[PDB]
Write a structure and sequence with these properties.
part of a larger assembly; 2 chains; A: mini-chromosome maintenance (MCM) complex, chain A, domain 1; five-stranded mixed barrel; elongated; B: about 50% helix; about 0% strand; binds phosphothiophosphoric acid-adenylate ester; binds magnesium ion; binds zinc ion; helicase (chain A); phosphoprotein (chain A); ATP binding (chain A)
């Protein structure tokens, strides 16, 4: 037939029209022609290149643009829009033949090609779906809330007869309904036939709950939700909590005896997803060369610190501590017996309104594995490990908590002072031995909790006191204060010049944020940080020894002079650990004397800031050589 | 202060332990130099060898 004759319809509906064999083979021929000959008048066929790429990477998905099919064969685009199931089946057979022409043995390897329609023009929200959209193609936006596990769904079903024992040839399984068998062809009987899963072929199946994104929801109304079924190649592509656009067939669930609660013949609906599009710390070979180029620069550490938290103004010491915590040191197990922690723990103790929460959020966006937890609030991952039974599923799960989940990563704890006893024991154990022991519900085990910790806390009474020292200013007991490497005390002393630039920064953010209206870019910095944590592992040599013992001996006796809380071995280890993170920002295999001096500066500045006002003025002049 | 005055628990708990050690902060230069050298030996890798 012809395209104009395809536009005219003889059957009652479009589905029965496409169902006719002459019309179906005409559609298949026209779709094969369109797949073969289509070009953008640039001398290149995009679909031939796509077929070659999917053949070379061994993929069962062919991404087909809807605009290309619409401009060339408008009636076929209309047929795909209104009756997508059988149209997609036909064009899947067409694309399978097109791939077969390119690769002859691709059929025995895969035997299935799924066509993913891209750039469907009309976009529906979840609240405006009606029955007119049923059995039609729809493109909707939404945020994924939860996803099930991947299940095997029958694809090529193979049966065996109980009377004879013979295995009867495979049948394709429709995804819409269950298929059954009534004849044996060997016994010529209608006897009981059993499915054997050994010879049956399966495809992946997943269910995803999609809700309307809260920004698009009208004010008084609730966000609507739908169930989206993801097939074999589409499973586990959408992490819960991310916003996607799904194109698929809007259809009805079939359930026994409908719904007895309503009193009306009411059907549940789903979206059978044809395609998923999303609205990664992988570096290429060129990106590694660019990393070496930017790390060769002398002011790489200054530039990294300045790139820390662009929304935060004027807090250079906090940004330096964040840079050390993100880059981290080298954990070392010497001869098996003795273990030394190699990740920096930072505690931001500050008065309210000092933007600690924004810093924690920046670290969460920046770090590879960052887990946010809070002592005061409830809508967060808990810090304590547990074994819990689902009240619906009746199936137990072991959760390690935020500290175990942030293993080889970052744990960001907001409201550090407001914990209960169980959380305090959990973070105490995690900072003590980097593990969490659980003996509950028959499970006795130890989970690895080698997580760097960045915490935010407030002083007692809502304001820091300079005359009192650090231990009196917090409810935190001394052993949990000792485990932190960097202790950033932040107070907003009223200085007119500082308040002027801070207010100017806030107002300029407000003005640029209005709808009617040196730093490394963050995408590059994120991969640079991930590369440094897994590739460098800086080391130090034996001739650098004579200086660190020199300064540390000059440290402790000064702490003897004023009677403050002492410099222990932990301060020396914090010096040697922070220096291994400064050599990671330089991407250097050795730890230099300049990185070591900068680490000494950070540790001494954190020690002096933690003192009372009487001790601080004496300690500042004695260590002015190290602070510079 | 007394050893029982320093601990934040009952003095009768001390009697239940067979050996009690009181670890001291020496605050000496030559001991601090040696312990710093030892820790740098551990961190460098000379201690492993
Ligand atoms: N130096 C700064 N640069 C930029 N914004 C700042 C700065 N200091 C404060 N702010 C702003 O002040 C507000 C403080 O909000 P939060 O950071 O959420 O509160 P907080 O600092 O965590 O203190 P809490 O929650 O009361 S203990 C935010 O809008 C910040 O953007
Ligand atoms: Mg806060
Ligand atoms: Zn049989």
């Amino acid at each position: 037939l012809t395209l104009e004759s395809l536009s005219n319809v003889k059957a009652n509906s479009y589905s029965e029209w496409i169902t006719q064999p002459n019309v179906s083979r005409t559609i298949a021929r026209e779709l094969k022609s369109f797949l073969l000959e289509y070009t953008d008048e640039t001398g290149r066929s995009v679909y031939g290149a796509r077929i070659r790429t999917l053949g070379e990477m061994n993929s069962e998905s062919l991404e087909v643009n809807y605009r290309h099919l619409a401009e060339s064969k408008a009636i076929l685009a209309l047929f795909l829009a209104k009756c997508p199931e059988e149209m997609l089946k036909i064009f899947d057979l067409v694309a399978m033949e097109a791939t077969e022409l390119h690769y002859p043995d691709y059929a025995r390897i895969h035997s299935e090609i799924h066509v993913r329609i891209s750039d469907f023009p009309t976009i529906y929200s979840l609240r405006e779906l009606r029955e007119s959209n049923l059995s039609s193609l729809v493109r909707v936006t939404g945020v994924v809330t939860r996803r099930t596990g991947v299940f095997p769904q029958l694809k090529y079903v193979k049966f065996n007869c109980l009377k004879c024992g013979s295995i009867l040839g495979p049948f394709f399984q429709d995804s819409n309904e269950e298929i059954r068998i009534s004849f044996c062809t060997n016994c010529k009987s209608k006897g009981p036939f059993r499915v054997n899963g050994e010879k049956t072929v399966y495809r992946n199946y997943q269910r995803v709950t999609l809700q309307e994104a809260p920004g698009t929801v009208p004010p008084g109304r609730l966000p609507r939700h739908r169930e989206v079924i993801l097939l074999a190649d589409l499973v586990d592509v959408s992490k819960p909590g991310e916003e996607v656009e799904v194109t698929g067939i809007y259809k009805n669930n079939y359930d026994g005896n409908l719904n007895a609660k309503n009193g009306f013949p009411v059907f549940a609906t789903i979206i059978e997803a044809n395609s998923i599009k999303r609205r990664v710390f992988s570096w290429t070979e060129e990106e590694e060369r660019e990393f070496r180029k930017i790390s060769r620069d002398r002011g790489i550490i200054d530039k990294i610190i300045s790139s820390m938290a662009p929304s935060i103004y004027g807090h250079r010491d906090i940004k330096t501590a964040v840079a050390c915590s993100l880059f981290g040191g080298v954990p070392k197990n010497v001869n098996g017996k003795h273990s030394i922690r190699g990740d920096i723990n930072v505690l931001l103790l500050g008065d309210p309104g000092t933007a600690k929460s924004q810093i924690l959020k920046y670290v969460e966006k920046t770090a590879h594995r960052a887990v946010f937890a809070t002592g005061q609030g409830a809508s967060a991952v808990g810090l304590t490990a547990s074994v819990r039974k689902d009240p619906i599923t009746k199936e137990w799960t072991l959760e390690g908590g935020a500290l175990v989940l942030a293993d080889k990563g970052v744990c960001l704890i907001d409201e550090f002072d407001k914990m209960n006893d169980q959380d305090r024991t959990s973070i105490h154990e995690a900072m003590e031995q980097q593990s969490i022991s659980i003996s509950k519900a028959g499970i006795v085990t130890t989970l690895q909790a080698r997580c760097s910790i960045i915490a935010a806390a407030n002083p007692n009474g809502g304001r820091y006191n300079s005359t009192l020292p650090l231990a009196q200013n917090v409810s935190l007991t001394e052993p949990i204060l000792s485990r932190f490497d960097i202790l950033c005390v932040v107070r907003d002393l009223v200085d007119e010049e500082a308040d002027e630039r801070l207010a100017t920064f806030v107002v300029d953010s407000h003005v640029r944020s209005h709808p009617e209206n040196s730093p490394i870019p963050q995408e590059l910095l994120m991969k640079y940080i991930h590369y440094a944590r897994t590739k460098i592992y800086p080391k130090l040599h034996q001739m650098d020894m004579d200086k660190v013992s020199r300064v540390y001996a000059d440290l402790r006796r000064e702490s003897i002079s004023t009677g403050s809380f002492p410099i222990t071995v932990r301060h020396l280890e914090s010096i040697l650990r922070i220096a291994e993170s400064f050599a990671k920002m330089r991407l250097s295999e050795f730890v230099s004397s300049y990185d070591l001096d900068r680490a000494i500066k950070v540790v001494v500045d954190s020690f002096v800031d933690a003192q009372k006002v009487s001790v601080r003025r004496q300690l500042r002049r004695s260590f002015a050589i190290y602070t510079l | 202060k007394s050893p029982g005055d320093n601990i934040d628990f009952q003095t009768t708990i001390l009697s239940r332990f067979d050996m009690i050690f009181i670890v001291k902060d020496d605050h000496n230069e030559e001991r601090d130099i040696s312990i710093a050298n030892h820790v740098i030996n551990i961190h460098t890798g000379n201690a492993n060898a």
